[PDB]
Structures are given as C-alpha cells and as structure tokens.
Amino acid sequence: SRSYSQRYAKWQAKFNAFSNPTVASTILSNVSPVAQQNFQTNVPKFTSVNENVSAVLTQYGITGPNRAIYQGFGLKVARALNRIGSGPALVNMINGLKGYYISAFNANPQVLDAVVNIITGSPTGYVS
DNA sequence: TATATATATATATATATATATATATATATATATATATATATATATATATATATATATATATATATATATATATATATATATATATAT
DSSP: OOOHHHHHHHHHHHHHHHHSHHHHHHHHHHSHHHHHHHHHHHHHHHHHHHHHHHHHHHHTTOOTHHHHHHHHHHHHHHHHHHHHOSSHHHHHHHHHHHHHHHHHSOOOHHHHHHHHHHHTSSOSSSOO
16 A cells, blocks of 8 residues: 555656656657557547547537537447447446436437447447 | 180170060050049949838737647547556
8 A cells, every 4th residue: 555655756756767868768669669559459449439429419519518528428438348348238337427427517318329329329228 | 824615694885686673754555443523224232202022020800720838628549657456
C-alpha cells in the first residue's frame, strides 16, 4: 500500500527520469512502430462509429455538444465491444451504460437506442 | 706604352631622331571629375497630392480554412507515469 507522500514521491522520480532527452527518445523511438501498429489497428474501428453515429444524429436533428453526448455514448458501446465482445456481458454493460447517460447527462433514451441500433445493429436487452 | 675595333656607362660642345615626364602660349581631339544656366533621357533615394497593383507587418468588424497552444463538458484511441484489487 502507498500513501500520498509515497504516490507522489515515486511519480516525481519517474517523471523526472522520463524528461531526460535520451530516456524519452530511447523509449519513444523503441515503441514507435509498436504504437503505430496499435493505433492503426484499433482507431479505424472507432472512426467508423463516429461516422455512422454522426449520420444518425443528423437524422435526429442533433447539433452542437448534444452530438458529442451521443458520440461519447456510442464510443463507449464500441469500447466494451472490443474489450468484452458481443453477447450477455455486453448486454449487461449497455443496460448500465444507458442508465448512466440517461440519468446523469439527461440523454434521450430513444436516440441512445438509435445509436445502439447502429453499433450493435439493434437495441440491447435481447441478443440479436 | 700608344693605337684600333666591338660592347657597358659618365662628361665636354651643338644638332638631329626615337621614347619617359614637367612648363611656357593658345587651340583641337579623346577619356577622368567639379561647377555655371536650363532642358531631356536613364538609374539610386526623400517628399508633395490622390489612386492602383504587388509583397512585409499592426488594427477595426465578423466569418471561414490551415497549423501552434490553454480551457470548458464527456467519451474514444495512442503513448509517458502514479495508485486501487488480485493474478
């Protein structure tokens, strides 16, 4: 276990280390092509979500930051999908997620279902 | 010891020719400048008057696009760390 004093102390030491020209460049240049792979591998998956969800939002007349609300929701759905996969667990996730957005951010349930209807292909609850 | 010839100089006497300068007298031509008088042309600037075009900036008014940051609101992805929980 670690107290704040300890949390910070070590954080500082590592931050300092990293800031060193040679340390930063050593690490970053070594993980360059690796990171590139990872970025390329997963990012396109979410871009397509942003696109399709955007299309939906335009059909629903959603503008400004309100689009951003639903986009965040959609992205979250996709995230869970990637880290969990479709089926039961995803259903459990989406149900809670909807509750989160509906009541915490006053997102419109109906539109939220429209978002799910794209990413998953249908509203949740039932697997299909 | 003298004389002669051939070259390298210096002088005594004047003259001539050829080059390198300086002056006395004016004029002419050709170049390198400076001025007196105006005008013209061509370039290098500065100003008086406005306008136009092209570039280098600053602002007044809003909007748009492209990059460099900071924040407001959440979410996502990718990397750099710290922790909460176990493996």
